[PDB]
Amino acid sequence: EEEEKRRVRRERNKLAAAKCRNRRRELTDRLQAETDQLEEEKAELESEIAELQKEKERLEFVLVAH
Amino acid sequence: SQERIKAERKRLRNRIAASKCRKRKLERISRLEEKVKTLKSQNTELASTASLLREQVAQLKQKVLSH
DNA sequence: GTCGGTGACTCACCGACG
DNA sequence: CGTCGGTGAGTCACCGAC
Ligand SMILES: [Cl-]
Ligand code: NA
Ligand code: NA
């Protein structure tokens, strides 16, 4: 019965291992969702920039004509 | 015995597969952490370019409208 | 000095496939 | 068919933190 501290240790470490694996799955899912969102925000910014640069040059050529 | 050699070879094969499996998990995380850091940096730069262009556009609409 | 976190070995399980 | 590899989970050995 002295070796019963050994049994509680196995049970505690089992839960610790499950927690470690669950945190790694959660981190992977968090980072993937974060990447997806950041990729979307990058595309929108690149789109807004492209439209703004077009409008900038349009106005520049209107002004040069007057 | 052949039973022992076979059981040991299976453990070797599985130890190889486990190390490869674990490595791919950590490499996916490492790859994703880098991409997140890069995208945050790039989007900050893009946001500042957009902000400037918006002001430049605003002023040009004023120069045009003043005619 | 005990505890939890984690890398690594191992077994169970399942689908892949020659 | 029978064996393999990929993966989840239990275990051990080890370490750092409080
Ligand atoms: Cl070994
Ligand atoms: Na958890
Ligand atoms: Na290894």
mmCIF file of C-alpha atoms (C1' of nucleotides) in Angstrom, chain D:
data_model
loop_
_atom_site.group_PDB
_atom_site.id
_atom_site.type_symbol
_atom_site.label_atom_id
_atom_site.label_comp_id
_atom_site.label_asym_id
_atom_site.label_seq_id
_atom_site.Cartn_x
_atom_site.Cartn_y
_atom_site.Cartn_z
ATOM 1 C "C1'" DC D 1 -6.382 -11.551 -46.115
ATOM 2 C "C1'" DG D 2 -2.690 -9.927 -43.135
ATOM 3 C "C1'" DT D 3 0.486 -6.330 -42.097
ATOM 4 C "C1'" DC D 4 1.530 -1.721 -42.191
ATOM 5 C "C1'" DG D 5 1.540 3.360 -40.822
ATOM 6 C "C1'" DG D 6 -0.969 7.245 -38.532
ATOM 7 C "C1'" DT D 7 -2.852 8.732 -34.446
ATOM 8 C "C1'" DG D 8 -5.108 8.975 -29.569
ATOM 9 C "C1'" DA D 9 -4.171 7.909 -25.131
ATOM 10 C "C1'" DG D 10 -1.523 5.908 -20.909
ATOM 11 C "C1'" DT D 11 2.925 5.768 -19.072
ATOM 12 C "C1'" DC D 12 7.761 6.920 -17.656
ATOM 13 C "C1'" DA D 13 11.647 9.954 -17.078
ATOM 14 C "C1'" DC D 14 12.871 14.415 -16.649
ATOM 15 C "C1'" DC D 15 12.783 19.231 -15.730
ATOM 16 C "C1'" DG D 16 11.493 23.967 -14.094
ATOM 17 C "C1'" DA D 17 8.679 26.650 -11.162
ATOM 18 C "C1'" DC D 18 7.060 28.199 -6.837
#
